[PDB]
């Protein structure tokens, strides 16, 4: 994450690592929405223009990690994918619309001080908290800079939500209803952004009415990183809430 700070420890227990089996390389991030399911960005799994196609076998999850490197032996959990679920109309041929995907873990995780699920917004939360100006916060082990540089530890950056029209004009790609962009404007003389490597990583907001944290979005894409006048786009987690549950309480 560009212009972030080292995550405190146990600050974002829902943060997951999506690691490709071998080469053992870090590909994206994700969240624990329960003890059996991890939510991520579809494109982490599927992106043909880049001959990207993972199956519940070339990958594996890592939960409760802090350090990007050290296998934190009595903290972290290495879990294995059971099944994957890419959104049926996840538009990779256009704007990466519906960048959502789900992974069913084989054997359930055991919540520890360092491993605990985030909540999915209910219409009321979503409705009152998804408003321009509100700040939410990203977390990832992705590149710290657009170019030239990988953290040793999880990072954070709180970015305010931007007005759709500002986002809209922010770029050439067709922005949809199932997207929000967030970041500082050029004059707010503040910066921060999620960068490449950050996908799947959660965009969470804390609630005033009850104090629970809520996955409002997912690091989808963006142009460059921390560029001026560009915003980082996020999946509208709310907006694909039914597919989320249609699949889960499915099987």
């Amino acid at each position: 994450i560009v212009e972030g700070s080292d995550a405190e420890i146990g600050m974002s227990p829902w943060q997951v690592m999506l690691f490709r089996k071998s080469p053992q390389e870090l590909l994206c991030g994700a969240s624990l929405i329960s003890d059996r399911w991890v939510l991520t960005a579809a494109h982490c799994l599927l992106y043909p223009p880049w001959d990207k196609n993972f199956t519940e076998n070339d990958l594996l999850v890592r939960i409760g990690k802090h350090s990007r490197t050290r296998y934190e032996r009595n903290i972290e959990k290495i879990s294995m994918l059971e099944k994957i679920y890419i959104h049926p109309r996840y538009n990779w041929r256009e704007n990466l619309d519906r960048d959502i995907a789900l992974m069913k873990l084989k054997k359930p995780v055991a919540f520890s001080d360092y491993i605990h699920p985030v909540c999915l917004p209910d219409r009321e939360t979503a409705a009152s908290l998804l408003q321009a100006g509100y700040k939410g916060r990203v977390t990832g082990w992705g590149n710290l800079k657009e170019t030239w540089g990988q953290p040793s530890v999880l990072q954070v950056v709180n970015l305010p939500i931007v007005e759709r029209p500002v986002c809209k004009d922010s770029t050439r790609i067709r922005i949809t209803d199932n997207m929000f962009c967030a970041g500082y404007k050029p004059d707010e003389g503040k910066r921060g952004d999620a960068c490449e490597g950050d996908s799947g990583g959660p965009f969470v907001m804390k609630s005033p009415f009850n104090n629970r944290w809520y996955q409002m979005g997912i690091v989808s894409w963006g142009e460059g990183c921390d560029r001026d006048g560009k915003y980082g786009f996020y999946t509208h987690v709310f907006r694909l809430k039914k597919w989320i549950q249609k699949v889960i309480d499915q099987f």
């Binding site: 146990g10 600050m11 227990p13 605990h116 699920p117 700040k135 709180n158």
Partner: peptide
Amino acid sequence: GEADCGLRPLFEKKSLEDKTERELLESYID
């Protein structure tokens, strides 16, 4: 799973504030 969702055990539960969680809350009152 999710019922005890979104309550970090080393914070919300110990009643500690993460070093910036506050930047977010003030962001709404204002």
